[PDB]
Amino acid sequence: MEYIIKNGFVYCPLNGVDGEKMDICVKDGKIVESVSDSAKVIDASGKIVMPGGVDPHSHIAGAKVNVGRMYRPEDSKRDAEKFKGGRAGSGFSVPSTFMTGYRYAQMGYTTAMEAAMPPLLARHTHEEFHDTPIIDHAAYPLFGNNWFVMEYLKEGDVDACAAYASWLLRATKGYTIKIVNPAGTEAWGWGGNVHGIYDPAPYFDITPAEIIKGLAEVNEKLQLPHSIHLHCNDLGHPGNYETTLASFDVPKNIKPNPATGSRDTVLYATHVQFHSYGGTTWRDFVSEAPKIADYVNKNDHIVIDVGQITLDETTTMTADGPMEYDLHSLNGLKWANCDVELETGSGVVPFIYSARAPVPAVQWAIGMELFLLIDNPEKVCLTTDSPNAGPFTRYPRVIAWLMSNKYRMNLIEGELHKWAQRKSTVATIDREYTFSEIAQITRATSAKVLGLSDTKGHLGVGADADIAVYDINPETVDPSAEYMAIEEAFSRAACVLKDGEIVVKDGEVVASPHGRTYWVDTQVDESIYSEVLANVESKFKQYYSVNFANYPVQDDYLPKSAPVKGVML
Amino acid sequence: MEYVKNVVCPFCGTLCDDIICKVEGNEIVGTINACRIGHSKFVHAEGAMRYKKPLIRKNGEFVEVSYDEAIDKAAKILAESKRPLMYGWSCTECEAQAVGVELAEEAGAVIDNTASVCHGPSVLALQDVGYPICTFGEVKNRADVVVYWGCNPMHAHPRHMSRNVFARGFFRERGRSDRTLIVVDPRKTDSAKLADIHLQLDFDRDYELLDAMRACLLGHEILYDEVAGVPREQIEEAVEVLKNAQFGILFFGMGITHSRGKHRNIDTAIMMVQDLNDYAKWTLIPMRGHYNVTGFNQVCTWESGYPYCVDFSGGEPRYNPGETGANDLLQNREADAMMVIASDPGAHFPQRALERMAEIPVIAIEPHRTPTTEMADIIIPPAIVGMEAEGTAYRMEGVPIRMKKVVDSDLLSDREILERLLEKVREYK
Amino acid sequence: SEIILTPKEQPEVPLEAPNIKPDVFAGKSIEEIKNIQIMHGNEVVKLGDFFEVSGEPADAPEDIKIIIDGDVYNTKRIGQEMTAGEIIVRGNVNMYVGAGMKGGKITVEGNAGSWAGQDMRGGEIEILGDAGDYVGSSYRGDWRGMSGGTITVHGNADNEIGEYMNGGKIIIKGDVNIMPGIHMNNGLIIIEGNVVARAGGEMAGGTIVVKGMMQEFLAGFKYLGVEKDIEVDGEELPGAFYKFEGDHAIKGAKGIVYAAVGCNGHIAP
Amino acid sequence: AIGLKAYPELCHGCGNCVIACPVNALRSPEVAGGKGPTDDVEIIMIVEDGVVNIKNPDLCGKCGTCVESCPVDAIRLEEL
Amino acid sequence: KDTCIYCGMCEEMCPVDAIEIDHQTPSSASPVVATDIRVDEDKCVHCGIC
Amino acid sequence: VDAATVTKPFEGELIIDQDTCQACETCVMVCPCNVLSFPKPEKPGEKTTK
Amino acid sequence: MRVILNTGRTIWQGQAIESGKDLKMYVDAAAIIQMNPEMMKQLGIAEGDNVKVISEYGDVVVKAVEAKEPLPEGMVYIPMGPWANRVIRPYTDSTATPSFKNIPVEIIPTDEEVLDMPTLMKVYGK
Ligand SMILES: Nc1nc2c(c(=O)[nH]1)N[C@H]1C(S)=C(S)[C@@H](COP(=O)(O)OP(=O)(O)OC[C@H]3O[C@@H](n4cnc5c(=O)[nH]c(N)nc54)[C@H](O)[C@@H]3O)O[C@H]1N2
Ligand SMILES: Nc1nc2c(c(=O)[nH]1)N[C@H]1C(S)=C(S)[C@@H](COP(=O)(O)OP(=O)(O)OC[C@H]3O[C@@H](n4cnc5c(=O)[nH]c(N)nc54)[C@H](O)[C@@H]3O)O[C@H]1N2
Ligand code: SF4
Ligand code: SF4
Ligand code: SF4
Ligand code: SF4
Ligand code: SF4
Ligand code: SF4
Ligand SMILES: [K+]
Ligand SMILES: [Mg+2]
Ligand SMILES: [Mg+2]
Ligand SMILES: [Mg+2]
Ligand SMILES: [S]
Ligand SMILES: [W+6]
Ligand SMILES: [Zn+2]
Ligand SMILES: [Zn+2]
């Protein structure tokens, strides 16, 4: 087909466009030089044109997500929907798969990544992906508590660990090396945890620091498009900012070597809000977000996403088993758990972030500090660790908060507990993000760090025709005083194109194509690879509960496979 | 005689994936490693009816038709119903189950699986209090206390103990000798015969017994000197065994889902397991029955948001076990048509439900002759999953394993039948 | 202002009619009331397809009195989330009568199905016959249940009445089966008849009074002694009661169970 | 002449005996771990066609472990 | 509990059964006839017989 | 109190191949002298002599 | 005699359902009632004798059989199937799950015959 988007104010930070009236030309799914004048014209006049949104960190497909769906029928009853032409669905904080895809598209998102996939449960993730419409996607296999990973790194055998990763990435059709509470979830297999990056789990005798550094070497030896994706030890603990700063330094002398894309950072640290806590207990608790922001500003090896508190009743779901039990022990609410043999753990607990409550008030402020005190938006991504800190449907509200210090002050001086002012600096910060900087943290930074900025996160020629048009006129609209207009216009996009096909018109879904599954294809020395694959199968016969032949994901589960090349022989 | 190894067994929720099939001339004639039940499903027993072709009853005698005519009659029934019930699902693969949900939306149906006569009570329990589980390999490699509460694995999950208890694991290299085995059952089952501790409690008193165990666990004296026929001192000793575990697993089954209290028996079992984790690592696993009952609940949940007893009558999905369950719609005479796929409610529902199935149109996607096919008005024989057709199944603790097609069949698969049926139901509206 | 709904033959496929409540009738003529949406299975139908309608309208819900002059044993959700006015049912009802109501009064002169007064916030429900399970309960998964209002069953009820209760008052003048007050956090339940078993199971707070016999009780309750002539939430009950605190399977539990001394001697330790 | 003896008509094919057997375990890591052998290995017995089936009785040391792991007396050590 | 040789005479002679001993059959891995001894000071009436 | 004295008929040595042992417990049950046993790990994740 | 009826799985009923509900194998394995030897004495029956089972919810005829898995006093066991589901409690207590286990029933000897599978289903007047 052919499309041309006319007279829209274009915001594309990867190509230096900062709200310039400019036409975008689309053909057969790509953005092109121009088109014949029989092209269908989309009048974006008086409206903002951005690339399709790219979510680097969401919990949307797989076992832990579906437990949250299953064991919260009351979350479904709060928010059940059925619109003509669409599938039925429900779930306010943990939406069903069709609903998940619909709601990402409505707010202009075309690509979102599943953040924590247990390898033995990979078929489950991909099956939900198939029932997730529109968005392209990928899943992050978990490595930070894997028995092969711990055994190989403790043997000093980084090369063998790299071959195992190559096999696992291919066998699970995964995309990044995700690290969640290294060693601590293995320790939770006995009802324990680790504390700090120098505290090993039982038997395996390898510290979190060694896991982080070993896995960052693997990542770059395999030339993966993304970096290691790190969820630090000691999540949610007063005084954990010291653990977090030490975790950031572990791999910073390793040089990034991606074979595909333009990633120039070796560490991606996710939902850093939960890792920026000062004090020693909940009673002397304070925000240490300025120290974290200062580190991010002064260092050029790291990208972060925030994990902003939306101040809702939501659901927590992480591969951080012991943390979730600790949460259940605090609020008393229903607790799910799943220790996965040889691989990982997980847990699910509802949680209510009331603005009137002191700690959630500070936590809200900590995320705002991280957004506003980090000077260069090229290092930060907008997230809520969906749904841990809030559902992704709240991203437009986070945007509005960042573009309007009046919106923030309304909350701070009204509902917000006074600890937001007493234990944080959010109230002294009057910075407001610009439409360009918003575009940067919702599309460009994530696309680049993920290694997909060739085709995603930008409107330049050669990209995929993933386009969003929002009904905002930047020459007319005041984002500071009209913050509610911003939130609503970013929640219901005027028009969204997915690979050159219109899928949303005026906030409503009009087409549901299946998206692509990106995964990482890597090649490793045949001799090493054979040696590892012999040891792996031998361990399956002894210790796994399934036969080796049945473990890898069959091609039936990737109807629309999109391999991305890492290292090649 | 081709040997097919690494076959996944399509019977029980243990979902053994190490079956070896003896294939002699596009037919399965024997197995290796499969238990006596598993072997029975893989192998045809002489004299048993296997439906070659579709059927429709006219005068109490069935008449052979084509797939198209039988699917057309079936789609006609569903499309003009005002409260159609689509029940079963647990013995077919997940793609067929997913078409079923889209069909249930189109038809405005109630879609429900066998959970509503099985671990549905466990589903209701876990929605209220949570779900602390692990996978089989963790039990195998870590567990030193194993508990079978109200289940009889020797008879219903025959290889479950050998795979999880006698098995030697990384931190349990002595196998059976490294594990304390507890069975809780009013009967001296063949499972209880292997146990180190058999709590032969009074029937229908588990809830009372677990109330005493929980209260003793939290440091409270037990009011009565005998609970559920178990002496006070023996209850305190049992609780001490659980507190001293390095890794405990609680397997449980129909003894507490079917007995007095139902979902509240599971409720209180779950909360004890949760609270045990302040003293010892503890988890539970429900002994899911059919090899892919867990799969239907997975699929339904992720597509609609709810696991079973899902009503699409209003467009939005709505959920109320006790109203929108299969036995509720039949016993209250709400349903005016029943579609049965991969299940035998004729054999396995109570008489009050059977009384309603006799009054309404009944459609059966069934390969064999059952009590359900006796109550049926249309019969549609499919290809059997894990023998003649492939697709995903979910083990009892959520592990997805792809069933395998061992032999060829001229018959249609469940997924194919439903896809054509769906298309015709759309039409008839 | 009285508005009469006279049922035609009830269908085997039940009706759902949450729009039968003063809040919806207010401001509408008799004819507009006839065009009101109700569900008939997977079909939306008009109220007039199953009810004759007569009477005088009114602008305000406080002033409307709906009279269902017949048996609607197969009609669900009558009075759901009503806030004012009155409904009188001269016959039986199906499930969810008064579910989530905030005010007004509902009288069922016959029997009511399960989930009568589920998630009640305020108002009165009076059932002159029997009720099913889950009188005054919560919804699946939600740990926040009924928080106000009063329900009265003059006959018997069944299982899990008062499930996850968090306020309000339930009175059963007859007998109940098992597990009244399961997971109760707050409120008051009075059972003037008997209980088969599991009164107060896993309760964390609130008060349960049984004036008849509990056949079985629970080892997790501590015995506190005997109190005579007690008054709970404006309800006075003469005579002596055994007093129990629990359910101490739950952490921090403060629930109270009172059981008449006459019929429960076997329950004392 | 005490030796192994099966009663396949009493057997559930549950596999307890195959796994418990130290001879089987020594020879097959899969058996040792509670799995039926998939690799071709020569062990004392397996479950075949749904029932225990002695294959290499010459390897049996008549220790009685398998016997004590069966609750239905489907495998015994006795005079032959 | 170090000096204690677990003869069990206190446990027999306690008039109110306040002393409990965790008896066991020895093994080469646990070569002791008992693993613990305890006094329930809620029951003890301090007669000094033990 | 070193009150029991014993002398044995034979002198010798016991040798165990831990990796060949499959822990079927036969020898443990057979030993008339209680020499052999299956130690329990003191801590989760701790391994013992088979 | 008033007994408690428990129902559930047996390995033989499992083998029978996967061979065929139409085979005699299924009647022999699921149209039975397992009883303790001592209960059969007090009632004057032996293995193979047929038993009339009456409950509040229906009636059925099953063949008596000595239980190899011993039962507590006062309990009998009928394997899951259409014969067992003639007499167990249907009501779900608003959970959707019928009460399949532990149901008060009356048992008496009978010279009446055990109905096979197609014949038993005729009682529902299809
Ligand atoms: N009295 C009593 N009654 C009970 C129970 C009890 O304990 N006691 N338990 C209850 C429980 S827990 C359950 S789940 C039910 C049993 O639930 P059911 O589902 O009724 O059990 P089955 O008889 O195995 O039914 C499976 C049917 O599907 C057919 N089938 C096999 N493979 C396929 C396939 O690939 N495709 C299709 N379309 N069909 C296939 C089989 O031939 C068989 O007839 O019984 C319930 N009823
Ligand atoms: N042979 C065979 N195997 C099967 C099936 C089959 O039909 N046949 N179907 C499969 C299915 S669908 C399922 S759900 C599983 C079910 O497998 P199980 O959960 O083992 O089901 P049951 O054998 O019905 O009941 C188990 C035990 O509960 C005990 N019980 C009864 N009442 C009480 C009580 O009050 N308290 C306690 N603690 N125990 C009680 C019974 O004595 C019985 O031994 O089996 C699966 N496997
Ligand atoms: S256990 Fe269940 S699964 Fe494994 S074989 Fe026996 S029957 Fe098939
Ligand atoms: S023998 Fe006893 S144990 Fe070995 S299989 Fe047959 S039953 Fe299971
Ligand atoms: S006796 Fe000892 S050896 Fe012979 S089989 Fe049974 S177990 Fe293996
Ligand atoms: S203490 Fe009691 S047991 Fe220990 S030695 Fe003195 S007396 Fe014997
Ligand atoms: S003092 Fe008297 S009572 Fe207290 S323990 Fe010693 S003996 Fe028993
Ligand atoms: S246990 Fe004793 S007998 Fe059994 S194998 Fe090890 S050594 Fe041989
Ligand atoms: K067969
Ligand atoms: Mg949900
Ligand atoms: Mg683990
Ligand atoms: Mg609830
Ligand atoms: S099941
Ligand atoms: W089942
Ligand atoms: Zn995380
Ligand atoms: Zn995350």
Q: Which residue has the tokens 């930047």?
A: A474
* Residue G30 three-state SS: helix
* Nearest ligand 3 atom to alpha carbon D14: 6
Do A44 and A8 touch, CB atoms closer than 8 A? yes
Do B123 and B130 touch, CB atoms closer than 8 A? no
How far from E50 is each of E2, E8, E35, CA to CA, in Å? 16, 10, 19
Chain B contact present for F47, CB below 8 A: yes
Flag if B159 and D20 touch (Cβ within 8 Å). Answer: no
Angle, helices A483-491 vs A395-403, to 10°: value is: 150
Residue F8: CB atoms within 10 A of its CB come to 7
C-beta pairs of A239-243 under 8 Å, 24+ apart in sequence: A239/A277, A239/A278, A239/A279, A239/A280, A240/A275, A240/A276, A240/A277, A241/A275, A241/A276, A241/A277, A241/A278, A241/A288, A241/A291, A241/A292, A243/A196, A243/A197, A243/A275
* Element at C222 (helix H, strand E): strand C222-232
Domain boundaries, chain C: 1-269
Q: What is the CA radius of gyration of chain B?
A: 23
- Using a 10 angstrom Cβ sphere, with 0-12 exposed, 13-18 middle and 19 or more buried, the burial of residue B379 is buried
Q: Which residues of B touch F43 (CB under 8 A)?
A: 246
Amino acid at A496: V
Residue A145 CB partners (closer than 8 Å, separation 6+): A180, A181, A182, A183, A184, A185, A186, A201, A319, A343, A344, A345
DSSP assigned state of A255: P
A180, β-bridge pairs? A231
Flag if F26 and D65 touch (Cβ within 8 Å). Answer: yes
- Pick the residue whose CA is nearest to atom 26 on ligand 1: B343
Residue D58: CB atoms within 10 A of its CB come to 6
* Residue B78 three-state SS: helix
- Residue F2 C-alpha, separation from nearest chain D C-alpha, in angstroms: 38
B255: region left, alpha or beta (phi > 0 left; psi from -120 to 50 alpha): alpha
- Residue B101 C-alpha, separation from nearest chain C C-alpha, in angstroms: 15
Q: Do chains E and A touch (3 or more CB pairs under 8 A)?
A: no
Domain boundaries, chain D: 1-80
| Residue B155 φ then ψ, to 5° | -105, -20
Q: Which residues of G touch B11 (CB under 8 A)?
A: 14, 18
Is the Cβ atom of F27 under 6 angstroms away from ligand 8?
yes
CATH of the domain at G111: 2.40.40.20
The beta-carbon neighbor of B319 closest among C40, C41, C140 is: C140
> How many angstroms from the chain centroid is the CA of residue D11?
11
Residue B429's closest CA among A108, F11, C43? C43
How far from F20 is each of B208, D32, F47, CA to CA, in Å? 47, 12, 17
The beta-carbon neighbor of D69 closest among B5, B38, B166 is: B166
Half-sphere exposure of G2 (CA within 13 A, CB side): 2
Q: What is the largest CA-CA distance in chain G?
A: 40
Instruction: Tell me the DSSP string of A153-180.
Output: HHTT-HHHHHHHHHHHHHHHT--S-EEE
Residue B32's closest CA among B45, B15, B46, B19? B19
Ligand nearest to the CA of D26: 8
Q: Distance between CA B201 and CA B229 in Å, rounded? A: 6
Q: Which of residues 302-361 of A touch B (CB under 8 A)?
A: 325, 328, 334-342, 348-349
Q: Distance between CA A563 and CA A92 in Å, rounded? A: 33
Q: Give the 3-state secondary structure of A100-111.
A: HHHHHHHCCEEE
How far from A251 is each of A210, A228, A451, B304, CA to CA, in Å? 10, 10, 19, 43
Domain boundaries, chain B: 1-45, 46-117+287-429, 118-286
How far from A449 is each of A441, A456, B64, B303, C166, CA to CA, in Å? 11, 11, 62, 31, 49
Chain A contact present for D8, CB below 8 A: no
- Residue C22 C-alpha, separation from nearest chain A C-alpha, in angstroms: 24
Q: Distance between CA C125 and CA C152 in Å, rounded? A: 6
Mutation site, C76, C95, C133, C182, interface G, largest G CB count within 10 A: C133
| Residue B227 φ then ψ, to 5° | -130, 130
Q: Distance between CA C52 and CA C30 in Å, rounded? A: 10
Residue D77 CA to ligand 5 center (angstroms) comes to: 9
- Residue E22 C-alpha, separation from nearest chain F C-alpha, in angstroms: 17
* Residue A93 three-state SS: coil
Q: What six digits make up the tokens of A217?
A: 């070497």
Q: Which residue has the tokens 């090493």?
A: A528
Reported structure resolution in angstroms: 2.5
> How many angstroms from the chain centroid is the CA of residue B314?
28
Amino acid at C175: D
Q: Distance between CA G84 and CA G76 in Å, rounded? A: 11
Q: Which residue has the tokens 């694995």?
A: B153
Chain D contact present for F28, CB below 8 A: no
- Using a 10 angstrom Cβ sphere, with 0-12 exposed, 13-18 middle and 19 or more buried, the burial of residue C59 is exposed
| Residue A124 φ then ψ, to 5° | -65, -45
What is the edge-to-edge ordering of all strands in the sheet holding B110-113?
Answer: B62-64, B55-57, B378-379, B362-365, B337-341, B84-88, B110-113, B310-311, B318-319
DSSP assigned state of A399: H
Q: What six digits make up the tokens of A567?
A: 């290292």
Q: Locate the chain B residue with the closest alpha carbon to F28.
A: B177
Query: What domain range includes position G41?
Result: 1-126
Do D46 and D69 touch, CB atoms closer than 8 A? no
Q: How were these coordinates obtained?
A: X-ray
Residue D56 CA to ligand 4 center (angstroms) comes to: 17
Burial string for A277-287 (b: 16+ CB within 10 Å, else e) reads: bbbeeeeebbb
